[PDB]
């Protein structure tokens, strides 16, 4: 009826009646894709799913 | 287009650049590549630009 593993930014957990799963950004590596080189500023600007 | 054995889940990561001595402002000397199926590097293929 209930569970919980994970840390903070990146738990799995279920809560009341409803499954709740976070993903920290930073830990995605998004800098780590592509070379610094062209390019200083990074920002996400959608998502589909 | 980069026709490879390539799967889901999977994305390319390829850099096109031009090195000329002309120089056009920024925002067009490079461009990305993630797909690679026909991508134009652009979310739109628009000419009216």
Same mark, same amino acid.
């Given at each position: 009826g209930k569970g919980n593993v994970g840390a903070s930014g990146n738990e799995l957990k279920l809560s009341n009646r409803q499954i709740e799963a976070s993903v920290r950004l930073?830990?995605?590596?998004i800098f780590s894709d592509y070379p610094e080189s062209l390019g200083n500023t990074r920002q996400l600007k959608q998502v589909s799913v | 287009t980069l026709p490879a054995?390539? *799967?889901?889940?999977?994305?390319?990561?390829?850099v096109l650049n031009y090195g000329g001595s002309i120089v056009?402002?920024? *925002?067009?000397?490079?461009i990305a590549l993630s797909h690679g199926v026909n991508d134009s590097g652009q979310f739109m293929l628009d000419f009216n630009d």
């Open positions: 930073s830990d995605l590596k | 054995l390539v *799967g889901p889940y999977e994305d390319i990561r390829a056009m402002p920024r *925002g067009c000397s490079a």
